[PDB]
């Protein structure tokens, strides 16, 4: 209610928030994976999967 | 060169002639300015850009 931004920037901000909330403790989180050096399992997280639609589609691979 | 005299092509002021005649073959220059773009109706809202950032543009933009 106390906001003036549009759904786009708000969606970006909420995606970042959700992606940060995975910064807690427990496996399946980014700290444990970093300790295990499983840099690959990060690509398959669900949060990046929810923020992906916001990416420029013509250059998302690069 | 310029329209209303399209049958002429200046080269250091030297006017040259075209062996042909055209009234529309030249009128369509929407693709002779840039490579993968086309002119459109004027819109001030659109932001000014350079020739380099063009690579990171999308469609309908």
From Swiss-Prot, chain B:
It is found in: Virion; Host nucleus. Plays an essential role in transcription initiation and cap-stealing mechanism, in which cellular capped pre-mRNAs are used to generate primers for viral transcription. Recognizes and binds a wide range of cap structures of target pre-RNAs which are subsequently cleaved after 10-13 nucleotides by the viral protein PA. Plays a role in the initiation of the viral genome replication and modulates the activity of the ribonucleoprotein (RNP) complex. Belongs to the influenza viruses PB2 family. Influenza RNA polymerase is composed of three subunits: PB1, PB2 and PA. Interacts (via N-terminus) with PB1 (via C-terminus). Interacts with nucleoprotein NP (via N-terminus). Interacts with host ANP32A (via C-terminus); this interaction promotes viral RNA synthesis. This is Polymerase basic protein 2. It comes from Influenza C virus (strain C/Johannesburg/1/1966). The chain holds residues 676 to 736 of 774 of the full protein.
């Amino acid at each position: 209610d106390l906001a003036v931004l549009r759904d786009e920037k708000t969606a970006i901000t909420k995606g970042y928030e959700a992606l940060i909330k995975r910064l807690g403790t427990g496996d399946n989180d980014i700290p444990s994976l970093i300790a295990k050096k499983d840099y690959l399992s990060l690509y398959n997280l669900p949060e990046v999967k929810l923020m992906a639609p916001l990416i420029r589609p013509n250059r998302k691979g690069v | 060169w310029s329209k209303a005299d399209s049958s002429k092509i200046y080269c250091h002021g030297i006017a040259i002639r075209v062996p042909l005649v055209v009234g529309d073959e030249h009128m369509d220059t929407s693709l002779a300015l840039l490579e993968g773009f086309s002119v459109c109706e004027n819109d001030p809202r659109a932001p000014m850009v350079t020739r380099q950032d063009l690579i990171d543009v999308g469609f309908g933009q």
